[PDB]
Amino acid sequence: MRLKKRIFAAVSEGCVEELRELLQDLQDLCRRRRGLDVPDFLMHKLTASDTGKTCLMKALLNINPNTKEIVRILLAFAEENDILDRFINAEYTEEAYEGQTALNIAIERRQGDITAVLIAAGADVNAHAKGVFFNPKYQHEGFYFGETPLALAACTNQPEIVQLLMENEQTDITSQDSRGNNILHALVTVAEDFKTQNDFVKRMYDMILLRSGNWELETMRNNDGLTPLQLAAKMGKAEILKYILSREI
């Protein structure tokens, strides 16, 4: 057998027709003697045992004109077999990329439409990865963004995704990461004294506070005991610091 490898090949090239046929083959196989229950059996067939990469992650890492349809098929298949939540929330197991999920891959790759579907279909909007991105498209691998989907969308200037997540009451907007940083501390780390970005970060900062109403984001302290303003002062970032101060009046 090479069913698993065929399925990874199909989602990677975007062969929608072949994928449907292969997943019918996989369904048929469930009836046969196996050493696992159906959900563990399917998850193994759909997950590289090596790295923990699922075929959903493989699909999002290889964007092509058929990706949205292939994502629909994979989620339908998982849902038909009662493993939708387990499948969509699977995490990389390879140490370097530990904790990365389908949802992080879609956001970093700026796939807003797919991102909305992944969230509605049950992707954990509070999941934190502390490994680096696997094969990121736009950001450096070790890009620091405050370790949440909301903070990832904000720090990469994707305000429609930030708005979608803030409307979702499952999202923990005041979450603090392994540094004790909340989304505003994260924005402070991404700010710089430029002119080409000297817009998006402060606009995002303002939009998050205005739309969330979570004013306490400004007064909560990270592990070094620093509010976002004090973090900007510690980092010697004059411009975002003057922006934050301006909020006082």
Domain assignments of the chain as residue spans, ordered by start: 1-249
Q: CB-based contacts of 128: which residues, under 8 Å, 6+ apart?
A: 99, 147, 148, 177, 178
Half-sphere exposure of 65 (CA within 13 A, CB side): 0
| Closest listed residue to residue 30, CA positions, set 45, 18, 10, 17 | 45
Q: CB-based contacts of 237: which residues, under 8 Å, 6+ apart?
A: 188, 191, 192, 193
Question: How many residues in the chain?
Answer: 249
Q: CB-based contacts of 30: which residues, under 8 Å, 6+ apart?
A: 38, 41, 42
- The gap from C-alpha 185 to its chain's centroid, in whole angstroms, comes to 19
For the record, the structure tokens of 30 come out as 């469930």
For the record, the structure tokens of 211 come out as 């739309």
Q: CB-based contacts of 65: which residues, under 8 Å, 6+ apart?
A: 14
d(CA 81, CA 157): 36
The CATH H-level (homologous superfamily) assignment of domain 1-249 is Ankyrin repeat-containing domain (1.25.40.20)
d(CA 208, CA 16): 39
CA angle 198, 203, 206 (to 5 degrees): 135
Distances (CA, A) of 38 to 12, 98, 202, 208: 25, 26, 49, 43
CA angle 156, 192, 166 (to 5 degrees): 35
